[PDB]
Amino acid sequence: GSNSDADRAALQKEVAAQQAELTRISDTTTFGGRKLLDGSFGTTSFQVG
Amino acid sequence: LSNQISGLNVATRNANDGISLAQTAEGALQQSTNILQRIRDLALQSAN
């Protein structure tokens, strides 16, 4: 209602926790100590021939 | 004819010796082909 939740601050804390958890999902995907979807994916090329 | 037959006998013996040497060569080259095969396997799995 744009004014009914004076705890929009706590709502922002919830959103920031969700954002940090997303940043963590970025990490922890180290399939080989080489976390894929974030940071350093060198646009690899799986040789199949 | 005796000289010819004796020479032909010793020549057949030398030819059999050469056959044995070339057969050792066949075996060694087959071993090297196996090594190159394994090298191709490790190189292709080396795509990693």
UniProtKB/Swiss-Prot annotation, chain A:
It comes from the Bacteria. It is found in: Secreted; Bacterial flagellum. Phosphorylated on tyrosine residue(s). Transmembrane segments: none annotated. Belongs to the bacterial flagellin family. Flagellin is the subunit protein which polymerizes to form the filaments of bacterial flagella. This is B-type flagellin. It comes from Pseudomonas aeruginosa (strain ATCC 15692 / DSM 22644 / CIP 104116 / JCM 14847 / LMG 12228 / 1C / PRS 101 / PAO1). The gene is fliC. The chain holds residues 102 to 150 of 488 of the full protein.
